Amino acid sequence: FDESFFSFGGHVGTSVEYEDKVTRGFNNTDKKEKTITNEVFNFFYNNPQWNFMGFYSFKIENREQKEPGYYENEDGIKQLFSLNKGHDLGNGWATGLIYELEYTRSKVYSPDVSGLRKNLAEHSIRPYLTYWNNDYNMGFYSNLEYLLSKEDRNAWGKRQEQGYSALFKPYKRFGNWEVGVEFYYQIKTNDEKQPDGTINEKSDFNERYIEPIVQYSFDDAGTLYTRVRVGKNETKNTDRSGGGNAGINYFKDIRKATVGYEQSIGESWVAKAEYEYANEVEKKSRLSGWEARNKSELTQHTFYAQALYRF
Numbered sequence: 283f284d285e286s287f288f289s290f291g292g293h294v295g296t297s298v299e300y301e302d303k304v305t306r307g308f309n310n311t312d313k314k315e316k317t318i319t320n321e322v323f324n325f326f327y328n329n330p331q332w333n334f335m336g337f338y339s340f341k342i343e344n345r346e347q348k349e350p351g352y353y354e355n356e357d358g359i360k361q362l363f364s365l366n367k368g369h370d371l372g373n374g375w376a377t378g379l380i381y382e383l384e385y386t387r388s389k390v391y392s393p394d395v396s397g398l399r400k401n402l403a404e405h406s407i408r409p410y411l412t413y414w415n416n417d418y419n420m421g422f423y424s425n426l427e428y429l430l431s432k433e434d435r436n437a438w439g440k441r442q443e444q445g446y447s448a449l450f451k452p453y454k455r456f457g458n459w460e461v462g463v464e465f466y467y468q469i470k471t472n473d474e475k476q477p478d479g480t481i482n483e484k485s486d487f488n489e490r491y492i493e494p495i496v497q498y499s500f501d502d503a504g505t506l507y508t509r510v511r512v513g514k515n516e517t518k519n520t521d522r523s524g525g526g527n528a529g530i531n532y533f534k535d536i537r538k539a540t541v542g543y544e545q546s547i548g549e550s551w552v553a554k555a556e557y558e559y560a561n562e563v564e565k566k567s568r569l570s571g572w573e574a575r576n577k578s579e580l581t582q583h584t585f586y587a588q589a590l591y592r593f
């Protein structure tokens with residue numbers, strides 16, 4: 283018991299993420315955003331004696347937004363707390379529960395506000411079920427999720443999102459290869475109000491995607507991988523939404539491609555680098571009248587690098 287407290291391994295590390303986004307919106311102009319995320323600490327804790335995994339991350343985030351006649355800068359701190367109590371069921375089966383809390387505090391600067399504060403709390407509860415068949419070298423990861431997101435933007439009001447998701451990812455290993463496909467479905471309700479209670483948004487949302495992944499492990503080196511996502515989502519406003527969005531539906535097509543490489547360096551260090559492309563095209567059921575076109579297109583390039591020390 284006292285001894286079990288000391289039987290942990292895991293990793294400590296750091297990462298940096300750079301995100302370059304351009305959204306050409308319904309007004310047919312470019313909103314350009316650059317975000318840098320500095321993960322000053324991330325801590326993976328693994329106690330096989332408890333069959334318990336924990337994760338903690340501290341991030342500093344800075345975003346700059348630029349578009350015709352407007353700018354916005356946002357600086358934030360994000361902490362993640364994650365607890366995973368697992369359970370070996372034998373014969374290749376396992377189950378467990380994840381409880382995850384992510385808190386973000388940020389300040390926004392623009393020509394119109396100076397240090398407007400935003401507080402975000404997101405809670406994720408995920409029962410999961412895994413299977414691995416050693417004879418076939420095939421298995422799957424699966425989970426359900428309840429997700430609650432609550433954001434207080436002070437003068438800009440409050441927003442709550444609440445819903446569920448399901449994920450199923452079968453995968454197979456053969457030689458140095460591993461191939462998998464992630465299937466994902468999410469539903470949620472959005473509720474956003476101004477401080478006096480005026481409704482900005484009341485809407486129902488759903489998303490689905492399928493994402494194949496291929497990886498190859500080099501005998502004398504690391505693991506190279508690629509993932510490609512094709513998905514869709516929809517946001518359907520009730521008659522109570524504001525801003526001309528009453529009864530309006532948004533439909534989005536999603537395409538992503540990722541390539542990454544991870545390699546161990548000696549016995550303890552592991553480094554990973556990854557590039558992701560994302561292109562998302564949105565249209566409305568009906569334009570309000572101010573729009574220049576029925577199209578809003580996001581193109582995003584993300585660069586990610588991570589260095590971890592295993593123990």
Ligand SMILES: OC[C@H]1O[C@@H]2O[C@H]3[C@H](O)[C@@H](O)[C@@H](O[C@H]4[C@H](O)[C@@H](O)[C@@H](O[C@H]5[C@H](O)[C@@H](O)[C@@H](O[C@H]6[C@H](O)[C@@H](O)[C@@H](O[C@H]7[C@H](O)[C@@H](O)[C@@H](O[C@H]8[C@H](O)[C@@H](O)[C@@H](O[C@H]1[C@H](O)[C@H]2O)O[C@@H]8CO)O[C@@H]7CO)O[C@@H]6CO)O[C@@H]5CO)O[C@@H]4CO)O[C@@H]3CO
Binds near residue numbers: 544552590592
């Ligand atoms: O938590 C740190 C981790 O976070 C991120 O990974 C997430 C990932 O993006 C999601 O996809 C998801 O992963 C689920 C996945 O989709 C499912 O396929 C399944 O995973 C199965 C694997 O597919 C299958 O390969 C096998 O995995 C085994 C490995 O092949 C084997 O090498 C070994 O793994 C050990 C590593 O060799 C060792 O280096 C160390 O791993 C560290 C990583 O190197 C490091 O990058 C980091 O990982 C991040 C990751 O980058 C994020 O993308 O920390 C790791 C821990 O230090 O530790 C390994 C332990 O031995 O053994 C494994 C297991 O046998 O089996 C799995 C099924 O178990 O399930 C996934 C959900 O668990 O979730 C994660 C977040 O956890």
Ligand SMILES: OC[C@H]1O[C@@H]2O[C@H]3[C@H](O)[C@@H](O)[C@@H](O[C@H]4[C@H](O)[C@@H](O)[C@@H](O[C@H]5[C@H](O)[C@@H](O)[C@@H](O[C@H]6[C@H](O)[C@@H](O)[C@@H](O[C@H]7[C@H](O)[C@@H](O)[C@@H](O[C@H]1[C@H](O)[C@H]2O)O[C@@H]7CO)O[C@@H]6CO)O[C@@H]5CO)O[C@@H]4CO)O[C@@H]3CO
Binds near residue numbers: 308309352482526
């Ligand atoms: O060029 C101006 C602007 O025009 C277009 O926006 C549309 C928008 O697409 C429509 O949906 C609608 O907006 C409604 C919303 O539906 C409703 O939510 C509400 O908006 C509130 C926000 O939800 C809340 O977050 C806050 O918004 C802040 C915001 O966080 C800041 O980012 C800042 O907004 C700027 C944008 O960043 C910038 O892109 C641009 O907006 C364009 C937009 O690209 C285009 O699609 O300018 C704005 C402001 O300069 O500021 C606000 C706070 O001022 O506050 C609101 C308060 O309700 O209200 C709107 C209004 O109906 O209609 C707009 C305009 O037609």
